[PDB]
């Protein structure tokens, strides 16, 4: 999975901004959120979210769902590193295991339960 954010910002600039934001707001985790390719679903105004780390993935679904506003034909799934994170995982734990080398966590969303479908 590829993110547009990674294509628009060079690695060394992401990494330094990531290190800074983790040291300045350690109770949150920096999360890049983008729509998966081929997803037929609503768009999100912003990509960069600072998220309370003790928030579960299920609760993050709630927060993202609200800002998307799902329609009757919709469903909502999260992908991190080609993997649907368990609704029971905390954002902190998810960050721990899956944050990239720029200290950002990258999450894609879709109306299909397979990334890129």
């Amino acid at each position: 999975m590829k993110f547009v954010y990674k294509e628009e910002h060079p690695f060394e600039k992401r990494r330094s901004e990531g290190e800074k934001i983790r040291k300045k707001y350690p109770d949150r985790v920096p999360v890049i959120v983008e729509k998966a390719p081929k997803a037929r679903i609503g768009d999100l105004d912003k990509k960069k979210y600072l998220v309370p780390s003790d928030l579960t993935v299920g609760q993050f679904y709630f927060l993202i769902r609200k800002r998307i506003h799902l329609r009757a034909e919709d469903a909502l799934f999260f992908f991190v590193n080609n993997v649907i994170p368990p609704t029971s995982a905390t954002m902190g734990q998810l960050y721990q295991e899956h944050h990239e080398e720029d200290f950002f966590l990258y999450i894609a969303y879709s109306d299909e339960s397979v990334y890129g479908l």
Binding site: I21, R28, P30, K46, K48, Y49, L50, V51, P52, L55, T56, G58, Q59, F60, Y61, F62, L63, K66, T87
Partner: peptide, 18 residues
């Protein structure tokens, strides 16, 4: 700041919803 945070109200709801 350049980062988006959810409002107080949104997060408190989420602390309940799941």
């Amino acid at each position: 700041d350049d980062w988006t945070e959810f409002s107080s109200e949104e997060i408190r709801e989420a602390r309940q919803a799941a």
